[PDB]
Design a binder for this molecule. Structure first.
Ligand SMILES: Cc1ccc(C(=O)Nc2cc(Cl)cc(Cl)c2)cc1Nc1nc(-c2cccnc2)nc2c1cnn2C
Length: 268
């Protein structure tokens, strides 16, 4: 993993928290903006193994839709994981702050990118376990990069909740939920239902209703991500292929799924 000298890093502002340290925005000289996760004095052996292990896995990833590791500081303390900086931040907040501002084709493009990143992770034998819009970063080209900021009942497949079976197929369930987040501009899955009410609804066969203005093909795809039987869900290769074909024949997205009105307004 590329080792960066501390003199090349300037931490500027705190942007969040890590396992045993803080996360910062800063600048890297070689200035490019970067995000910086630190491991502070007193960290345990297990925290060090997990921190350096995370850096090592991130260093093996090279994909347009996966956050890119700039380097690591391991030879000096505090230790640091340094990534590219994504100007538009996390996707859930981004869409909530830009409600209605994008075209259907732009939104589906986002999903294609997320799906390509997930196909790569799954092929690399990396199970994400926490896929949600809050863990996707957006750059100034609208490119979505799968990330993981650490800690999700509403996003998690039934077998993962029930007996802790996390696989790329439970990640597919989560991707379905991410599709719904994107097409709703960041609505909260299942709205005010409690965690127990969500699981009961899922077990009894209910599923999230179609978003407003949602292409029929897109709702059909998210519905197939939520099959109870794990083996029946599409693989990420299937998802990428479908999304790529829909984008390349964009008239395919003009057919919309019926939106079930929660409210009726009667006017003459
Ligand atoms: C520094 C860093 C370290 C680790 C990871 C990461 O994704 N690790 C990872 C991903 C995979 Cl797919 C697999 C495995 Cl093994 C590990 C990401 C970053 N970078 C960012 N993080 C945050 C941030 C904010 C608040 C709280 N925590 C983080 N904001 C950012 C970043 C870039 N731009 N912005 C606005």
């Amino acid at each position: 993993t590329t080792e960066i000298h501390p003199s090349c890093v300037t931490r500027q502002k705190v942007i969040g928290a890590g396992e045993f340290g803080e996360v910062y925005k800063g600048m890297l000289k070689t200035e490019v903006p970067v995000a910086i996760k630190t491991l502070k004095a007193g960290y345990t052996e297990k925290q060090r193994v997990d921190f350096l292990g995370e850096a090592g896995i991130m260093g093996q990833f090279s994909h347009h839709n996966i956050i890119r590791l700039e380097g690591v500081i391991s030879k000096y303390k505090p230790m640091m994981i340094i990534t590219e900086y994504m100007e538009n931040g996390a996707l859930d907040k981004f869409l909530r702050e830009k409600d209605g501002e994008f075209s259907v084709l732009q939104l589906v493009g986002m999903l294609r990118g997320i799906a390509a990143g997930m196909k790569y992770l799954a092929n690399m034998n990396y199970v994400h376990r926490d896929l949600a819009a809050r863990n996707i970063l957006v750059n100034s080209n609208l490119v979505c990069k799968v990330s993981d900021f650490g800690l999700p009942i509403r996003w998690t497949a039934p077998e993962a909740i029930s007996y802790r079976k996390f696989t790329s197929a439970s990640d597919v369930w989560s991707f379905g939920i991410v599709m719904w987040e994107v097409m709703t501009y960041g609505e909260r899955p299942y709205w005010e239902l409690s965690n127990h009410e969500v699981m009961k609804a899922i077990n009894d066969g209910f599923r999230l209703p179609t978003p407003m203005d949602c292409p029929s093909a897109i709702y059909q795809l998210m519905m197939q991500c939520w099959q109870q039987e794990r083996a029946r869900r599409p693989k990420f290769a299937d998802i990428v292929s479908i999304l790529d074909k829909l984008i390349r024949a964009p008239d395919s997205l003009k057919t919309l799924a019926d939106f079930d009105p929660r409210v009726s307004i009667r006017l003459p």
